[PDB]
Amino acid sequence: KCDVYLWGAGRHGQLAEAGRNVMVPAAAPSFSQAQQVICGQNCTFVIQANGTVLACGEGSYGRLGQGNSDDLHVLTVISALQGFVVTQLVTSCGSDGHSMALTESGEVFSWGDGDYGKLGHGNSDRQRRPRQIEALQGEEVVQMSCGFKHSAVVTSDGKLFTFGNGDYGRLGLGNTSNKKLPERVTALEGYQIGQVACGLNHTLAVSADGSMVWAFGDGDYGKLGLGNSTAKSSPQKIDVLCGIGIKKVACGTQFSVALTKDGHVYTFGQDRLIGLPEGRARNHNRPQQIPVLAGVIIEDVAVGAEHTLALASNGDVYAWGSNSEGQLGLGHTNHVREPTLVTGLQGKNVRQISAGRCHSAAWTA
Ligand SMILES: [Cl-]
Ligand SMILES: [Cl-]
Ligand SMILES: [Cl-]
Ligand SMILES: [Mg+2]
């Protein structure tokens, strides 16, 4: 067992017994068998240590993978993945919602809203239960991301595939067509891609050795980190992030986050969401280190739609950004510009975090 804390919006039952509108982290005893918790678009998934997946919250457009679209207020097993050991799960933080789960054998199952081909089945049909993406048969997928209207997967041999809505270049294929089947990002074929993150309408990718980062998609608010606000349909190196050793990247609606291996956080994009003091908004269109976290070793970051959580090596959790539903966990619903300590998690020995559209989670597994 572990301890799980949930907070933010809970009106569709996505926080189960923790409540309906929660401004401070609240214990969720029913989640105690979680090894992972994944917060999405008004929904929450759990992966148990044995590979079983459960879901609760908003069920619109098959979100919960139950074979129907019912809202659920208690964690409920996704029977359609029974038989498979699920190791990872990702879900979108906006639009009409979709999800991808990864098995032990490197196979990817997708479900939810089918618009734009983002599920990868060669059509745009809703899938109310998890369905294997057959086109990835024989690929060993190791990492995945769900954007608002597109998706992406990374393979063990370092290839990157994208699919879904093509508007503004977000698939990185050099045009803006929608793709209903996974497409190799040929521009990156000469490199080994280790991870991908997808936002409202841009995408970031990191090389396997952490030495290189690329951006593509819509350019608003300088969220591509290339020093302007122009959309790019092919991957473009983010020079500031190359050579510094990147552990992880993540994307929100109008901003990007990068974590270095030595525990520093860089942000870029819309000023209100990037956690910097106001003077530093000058260069919001290039990556900048977050000053208030300089004396903190950050082990992980989790990005929702418009908020960010950061976990320090001592277990402390920091939050900043939008907060109208209490998703920061700070006891109010006011916007917070810079990373702020979540005091409700002090002494809780948090080891993992997750951020959804407008709810959050932290737990001790
Ligand atoms: Cl399996
Ligand atoms: Cl290929
Ligand atoms: Cl490096
Ligand atoms: Mg634009």
CA–CA separation, 47 vs 53, rounded Å? 5
Among all bound ligands, the one having the nearest atom to the CA of 254 is 4
Cα(101) to centroid(ligand 1), Å: 11
Q: 12's torsion region: left (phi>0), alpha (psi -120 to 50) or beta?
A: alpha
Cα 23 to averaged position of ligand 1 atoms, centre (Å) = 38
The C-alpha angle with vertex 206 and arms to 205 and 211, in degrees rounded to 5, equals: 150
Whether the Cβ atoms of residue 64 and residue 12 lie closer than 8 Å to each other: no
**Nearest ligand by distance to the CA of 261:** 3
* C-alpha 104 – ligand 1 centre gap (Å): 5
Distance 300 CA to ligand 3 centre (A): 18
Round to whole Å and give the CA distance between 328 and 336. Answer: 8
Residue 255 and residue 218 in contact, taking contact as beta carbons nearer than 8 Å: no
* Longest distance between any two alpha carbons in the chain, whole Å: 54
CA angle 316–317–321, rounded 5-degree value: 155
Closest Cα partner for 202 from 226, 172, 237?
172
Q: Which residues contact 230 (CB under 8 A, 6 or more apart)?
A: 219, 224
- Residue-wise over 90-128: b if at least 16 C-beta within 10 A, else e? bbbbbbbbbbbbbbeebbbbbbbbbbbbbbbbeeeebbb
CA of 213 to the centre of ligand 2 (A): 21
The answer to whether 257 and 267 are in contact (CB under 8 A) is yes
Tell how far the Cα of 181 is from the centroid of ligand 2, in angstroms: 12
Report how far ligand 3's centroid is from the alpha carbon of 211 (Å).
Answer: 4
Q: Which ligand is nearest to the CA of 51?
A: 1
Helix (H/G/I), strand (E/B), else coil: 135: helix
Beta strands in 93-238 (DSSP E): 98-103, 108-112, 127-132, 141-146, 150-155, 160-164, 179-184, 193-198, 202-207, 213-217, 232-237
Lookup result for tokens 């300088």 = 222
CA within 13 Å, CB half, 16: 21
| Tokens (6 digits) for 11 | 């009106």
> What's the CA-to-centroid distance between 103 and ligand 1, angstroms?
5
With contact defined as beta carbons under 8 Å apart, do 39 and 99 qualify? no
User: Which ligand gives the minimal distance to the CA of 138?
Assistant: 2
Tokens 């745009």 found at: 124
Query: How would you class 214 by CB atoms within 10 Å of its CB: exposed for 0-12, middle for 13-18, buried for 19 or more?
Result: buried
- Cα of 50 vs centre of ligand 3, distance in Å, is 35
CA of 25 to the centre of ligand 4 (A): 36
Q: Are 53 and 77 in contact (CB under 8 A)?
A: yes
Residue 219 DSSP SS3: coil
Distances (CA, A) of 310 to 9, 264, 298, 299: 19, 10, 7, 8
State whether residue 308 is helix, strand or coil: strand
Cα 30 to averaged position of ligand 2 atoms, centre (Å): 42
Q: Is 68 exposed, middle or buried (0-12, 13-18, 19+ CB in 10 A)?
A: exposed
Q: 238 and 214 in contact (C-beta within 8 Å)?
A: yes
Neighbours of 196 (CB within 10 A): 26
CATH number, domain of 278, equals 2.130.10.30
Sheet holding 21-27, edge to edge: 21-27, 4-9, 359-363, 352-355
Strand order in the sheet with 232-237: 193-198, 202-207, 213-217, 232-237
Instruction: Answer whether 327's CB lies under 8 Å from 303's CB.
Output: no
Q: Which residue has 């409920």 as its token pair?
A: 76
- Quote the tokens at residue 71: 């809202």
- Return the percent helix, strand and coil in the chain, to nearest 5: 10, 45, 45
What are the distances in angstroms from CA 248 to CA 198, 206, 257, 273, 321? 13, 8, 8, 18, 19
Q: How far apart are CA 302 and CA 39, in angstroms?
A: 10
Ligand 4 center from residue 168 Cα (angstroms): 7
Q: Cα of 251 to ligand 3 centre, how many Å?
A: 21
Are 130 and 91 in contact by the 8 Å Cβ rule? The answer is no
Residue corresponding to tokens 């044995």: 50
Per-position b or e across 304-319, b if 16+ CB within 10 A of its CB: bbbbbbbbbeebbbbb
In terms of C-beta density within 10 A (0-12 exposed, 13-18 middle, 19 or more buried), how is residue 189 classed? exposed
| Distance between CA atoms of residues 354 and 317, nearest Å | 11
Residue-number span of the structural domain to which 110 is assigned: 1-365
Determine the distance separating the centroid of ligand 1 and the alpha carbon of 38, expressed in angstroms.
Answer: 20
Q: Which long-range contacts (CB under 8 A, 24 or more apart) does 229-236 make?
A: 229/285, 231/168, 231/169, 232/169, 233/168, 233/169, 233/172, 233/173, 233/174, 233/175, 233/176, 234/169, 234/172, 234/173, 234/174, 234/187, 235/172, 235/185, 235/187, 235/188, 235/205
CA dihedral 280, 285, 286, 287 (to 10 degrees): 70
DSSP symbol at 324: T
Q: How many domains are contained in the chain?
A: 1
For 261-267, the CB contacts below 8 A with 24+ separation are 261/210, 262/297, 263/296, 263/297, 263/298, 263/299, 263/313, 264/289, 264/290, 264/293, 264/294, 264/298, 265/289, 265/290, 265/293, 265/298, 265/301, 265/310, 266/240, 266/241, 266/290, 267/308
Q: From residue 247, how far is each of 48, 256, 312 by CA, in Å? A: 25, 14, 14
Tell me the CA–centroid distance for residue 305 and ligand 2, in Å.
31
Q: Where are the beta strands (DSSP E) in 232-350?
A: 232-237, 246-251, 255-260, 265-269, 288-289, 298-303, 307-312, 317-321, 336-341
